[PDB]
Write a structure and sequence with these properties.
Uricase (chain D); acetylation (chain D); binds 5,6-diaminopyrimidine-2,4(1H,3H)-dione; Urate Oxidase; about 290 residues; homotetramer; purine metabolism (chain D); oxidoreductase (chain D); eight-stranded antiparallel beta sheet; alpha+beta; Uricase_CS (chain D)
Chain lengths: ~290, ~300, ~300, ~300
C-alpha cells in the first residue's frame, strides 16, 4: 500500500485580539476559531515512523498566536492569506496550507451612544474563510456567511411540482418560508500575498453586499420556487463584484405544518384561517446550487 | 413504599402563531417551546397501573395548541397563566399545573431602513422565558426571565484583594476582559387568580425591557472589581423600578480569556500593558449566583 | 434590598486521573467533570465590593486538582464528600460547599477477549453522577444517580384506558414501541461527616450497580400499560435492596415512534398489526416523574 | 449566469424498522437517519422558476418510507443502493442520487446472561455510515465508514524527534496519554449496478467488523511514536483483507491531556514520572488525516 494523500494540523484554535485606539479611547475586538492543515514531503512519518519531517501541531498553534500578534487579523481573507503563506515559506518540505477561519460576532453595544468597550454576541451567524495556499499555484479563497436564519410568514408559494403515486403533498398559494442560509463566494485565483493586499478593501465590502442581497432578496421576492430565489441572489452578487468566480448557496428549509383543529368544536385553523402551526425539527428540505459566469 | 411527589406531562412542544393586521397588512410572529407538567390525585397510576386518572400527554399537547389558538400568546406570563389555569379548572384530580415557556427571537428585518411587514431574522440565541406555577387555592406564581444573553467588555474590569493562601496562584490585576452569559430571573408577587394577572398585563413586557436595559447598561458602565458587586447593582435597580417584584436572581458564568506569554519567541511583548492576543478558554469557568429581595 | 442567597465557585473543571498497579502492569483511569459552589459569610463582596472574603474560583480549581492528587477519586460519593469537607473545614466564613461530579465512562478494551492493560473505549454516553452537599453543623447529603441511559423495547407496552374528553384524539393501543432516556436518583440518609461516609464506602458502587440492573431488568421484563407503574416497580426494589437510601427519583423523558400510514400508496399495509416502518419523533415528548420513599 | 451544479433533496429523515421473526419471537430493530440528494435536468427551477421538473421534497420522504417498507434496510450499503437506484429509474430527468445513511446502535440487552427478545440499549454514540452515489451509467460508488468511536490509552504512546525551531515549545516525551475519535472510511471499487451490489452483500458487514476490529487492536497494541505511523498500520491491514476496497481514509482528532504542575504547593509531585492527575483539554486539538491506497510496485 501507498499514501495517496496526507494532511495534519491543528483544529479549533480560539483566538481573541483587541485593538486599543489611544487617540479616541475606542476598543475593537475580534474573535475567531482557526484551523490549519499542512501538506508536503511527509509520507515518511506515516510509512517509516519518521518524525523529523513533522512540524508539531503545538508549534502550529504558537505560530497562529505569533502571526496574530504581528499582523492584522481583519479582514479574515488577509489574515488567512498571511498565515498560510507563512507555512509554505518557512518550510521547504511543506507545499500546501489550508487555513480555515470562523469569525464570531462581537457587535459594539448602543447605550443611542456606541459604547467604546462593550460588546454583545448579537447572533449566532458567522463569517468564514477557507484559504488554500499551494506552492506555485498562488492563493484560492472561498469566503462565506453561514448560520443566518430567517423566516417570512407569507409571500411564498409551492405549486406545479411533479405529481405521481409518491406524491401526497397539497399545492399552496400562501405558506411560511424559513431557512438557514449558507453562502460561499469564490474569489479568482490570486498569484500571491501581494495581489491579495492590493485587494483588501474588496473583502469586507463584498461580505456586506452578499449579506444585504441575501436579506433583501429573501424578503422581497415572492416566488413559488426557492431555487429561483437562490439564483437571483447569486446573479446580483456576481453582477456586483468582478473578481468573484462562483457563488454557492445552500439552504436547509424549516417546515412549519398546519394543525387541523376541526375535530375540536369545529375550530377552523387550516387555509385562510391558519394561525397556529407546528415547527418541525426534521426532516428538512435541502437545496443547493453553484452559479458562475456565462 | 409510597409516592412522595409525582409530576407528568408534555415537554418540547414547539408552537408558532402569526398575527395578521387587517388595515396595515403588517404580520407578527411568535414562536415558543412549551413544557406543561401536572400534579394531583394521580398516585394510583403509579401504584396500581390505573390509567383512568391520566390525562394523556398527547392531550396536553392538543390543549396547548387549542389554548394558543383562542388566546393571546403574549406576554407569555399571560399565556402561561391561561394555560396552567385551564388544567386545574377542567379536572378535579389536577391540583397544580407547571408551565414553562421559552420564547425565541424573531426580529422584523430592516430593509433599506424601512421595517418589513412580514420577514424576520433570528437575531440572537437570547431567550425570554416564564415559569408559571398554578396551584389550587394558592393562586399563580410567575418567574420571568432572560437567558442566553452573551456580553464582553475588553477593559474596565478588575480583580484584586481576594484571599491568598497556599492554594492561590492567580496574580492580582487592574485591567482584564470580562465576558459572561447572563441568566436573570425576576419573581413576581403571588397573584390571586387569572383576574389579577389580566390586570397587570402591560407591566410584563415593560419589566422584561427594563431588566434587559439595566443589565446591558450596568455591565458597560460599571468599572468594577467584582462580578458580585456588579450583579448586586443590577438587582438593586430592578427591585427599585418595579414594585410587584419580590426577588431578582442573577446567574453569571464567567468565561475566561488568558494572556498568552509570547516572550520566548524573539522576546515578543504580549502581557501586561502589551497584551493584545489572548486565548478564550472553553472551560473551566467561574460561576457566580445570587438572590436579592427587599428588607 | 438584601442578599437572600448567594453562592459562587468553579463549573466544568475536567479532571483525569490514572492509577498504575506497578505489580500487575494494569492501569485504570477515571475522568470526571466537577463543579464546586461555596456558600458563607460573603454578603460584603456583593454589597460593598469587598473581595477579602472571596476565595478565588481559580483557587477552587487548584484545590480540585490538589485534592484529586492526594485522595481516591473513586467512588465519586467519597471524593465529593472529601472535597466539600475540605472547604467548610479550612475556611471560617464558609458554611456550605456544593459539589457536583459527572463521571465519564472509560471501559477497558477487550482485545481477543483478554482485558487490556491500558486502553479504553467510551462505550456509552451514559453518566454516573453525584451531588454532594456539605453544610456546617448539618453533615453531608449525597444524591447519587445515573443518567443518559437510553433504551427501547419494540413490544410489550400498551397504552389504553386513560381519560377521554374533547381534548383527546389519541387512539388506544395494545402493542406499541416504548423508548425513553432514564435519569434515576437515589438519595442517601444524611451522613454526619467524613468518617460515617468512609465506613460506608463499598455500599456506593454496589448501589449504583443495583440501580442500573434493576432499571434495565424491570424495563425489559415488565409488560405494562403504564409507564408510571413500571417506574414505581423500579423504585420499590431499589429501596428494598438498600436500607440507607431514603428516596428514589425517576425522570423518564420518553420518545415517540409514530406509525406511518402508507395505504394511499398501492394500498400498502403498514399500520397496527402490520406496522414495520415507523417515524421516530425528535419532539415533542412525554415526561414522567416521581419520588418514592418509605411509608 | 449559469448553473454550474445543483442538488436538492431531503435531509434528516428519521427511520425505524422492526423485523419480527414469529418462529422464535425474536425482534430486531434498525434505526437510521437518511439524506437523499437529487441531480439532473432541473436547471430551469432555478433560472426560470419552473416547478414542473421538481420531485417535491415531501415526495422524496414518502419514497424513503415506502422503499424501507418493501426492502431490506440492512446492510445499509444495499439499502442505499436500492434507494438511489430507484430515483434514476423512476425519473428520466434525474441522472444522479446521493444517499447518505447514518445508522444508530440499538444493541440487544442481556438480562441475567440471556439476550432479550425485544429490548435494546443505545450502548454508544458510534455510528456506522454509508455514502452512496448512484450516477447514470457510471454505476454505484460506495464510501462506507464508522465514526463516533472514542478511545484512550494511558501509556505506550510517545512523541519525540520532531522538527524544533523558534516556533517550538513542545517538550519531547516517551510516555503520554493518547486519545482520539476515530473516523474511518473505506471506499469500495465501483459496482456496475444493483445486481453486482446484491452479490457482494455478505462482504459489507464483514468489512465493517474487520475495520472496527483492526482499529481497536492496532490502537491498543501499537507502541507508536507517531499517530501517523499508527493510522497507516490500520489502513494497510484493512486493505490486505478486502480486495474490493480501493482506498482507506482515516481522520483522527487528537484530544490532549495536559500535565498539571502542582510543585508550587507543598512541593507536590505531579509531572513526568509521578503524573497522576491531568487536565483533559476541550480545544484546541491536533487533526491527522490520510488516504491509503494500493501500491503499484510488484
Ligand atoms: N502532538 C503530536 N502527536 C502526534 O502523534 N503527531 C503529531 O504530529 C503531533 N504534533
Ligand atoms: N404515550 C403515553 N405514555 C404514557 O406512559 N403516558 C401518557 O400519558 C402517554 N400519552
Ligand atoms: N476569579 C474571580 N473573578 C470574579 O469576578 N469573581 C470571583 O469571585 C472570582 N473568584
Ligand atoms: N417540498 C418542497 N418545497 C420547496 O420549497 N422546494 C422544493 O423543491 C420542494 N420539493
Amino acid at each position: 500500500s501507498a499514501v495517496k494523500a496526507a494532511r495534519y494540523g491543528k483544529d479549533n484554535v480560539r483566538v481573541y485580539k483587541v485593538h486599543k485606539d489611544e487617540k479616541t479611547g475606542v476598543q475593537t475586538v475580534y474573535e475567531m476559531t482557526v484551523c490549519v492543515l499542512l501538506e508536503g514531503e511527509i509520507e515518511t512519518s506515516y510509512t517509516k515512523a519518521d518524525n523529523s519531517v513533522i512540524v508539531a501541531t503545538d508549534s502550529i498553534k504558537n505560530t497562529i498566536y505569533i502571526t496574530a500578534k504581528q499582523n492584522p487579523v481583519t479582514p479574515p481573507e488577509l489574515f488567512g492569506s498571511i498565515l498560510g503563506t507563512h507555512f509554505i515559506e518557512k518550510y521547504n518540505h511543506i507545499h500546501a496550507a489550508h487555513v480555515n477561519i470562523v469569525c464570531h460576532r462581537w457587535t459594539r453595544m448602543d447605550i443611542g451612544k456606541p459604547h467604546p468597550h462593550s460588546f454583545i454576541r448579537d447572533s449566532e451567524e458567522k463569517r468564514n474563510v477557507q484559504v488554500d495556499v499551494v506552492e506555485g499555484k498562488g492563493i484560492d479563497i472561498k469566503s462565506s456567511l453561514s448560520g443566518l436564519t430567517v423566516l417570512k410568514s407569507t409571500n411564498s408559494q409551492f405549486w406545479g411540482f411533479l405529481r405521481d403515486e409518491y406524491t401526497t403533498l397539497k399545492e399552496t398559494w400562501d405558506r411560511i418560508l424559513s431557512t438557514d442560509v449558507d453562502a460561499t463566494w469564490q474569489w479568482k485565483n490570486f498569484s500571491g500575498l501581494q495581489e491579495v493586499r492590493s485587494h483588501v478593501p474588496k473583502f469586507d465590502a463584498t461580505w456586506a453586499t452578499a449579506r444585504e442581497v441575501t436579506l433583501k432578496t429573501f424578503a422581497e421576492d415572492n416566488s413559488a420556487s426557492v431555487q429561483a430565489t437562490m439564483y437571483k441572489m447569486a446573479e446580483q452578487i456576481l453582477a456586483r463584484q468582478q473578481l468573484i468566480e462562483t457563488v454557492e448557496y445552500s439552504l436547509p428549509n424549516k417546515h412549519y405544518f398546519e394543525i387541523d383543529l376541526s375535530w375540536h368544536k369545529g375550530l377552523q385553523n387550516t387555509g385562510k384561517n391558519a394561525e397556529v402551526f407546528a415547527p418541525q425539527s426534521d426532516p428538512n428540505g435541502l437545496i443547493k446550487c453553484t452559479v458562475g459566469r456565462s
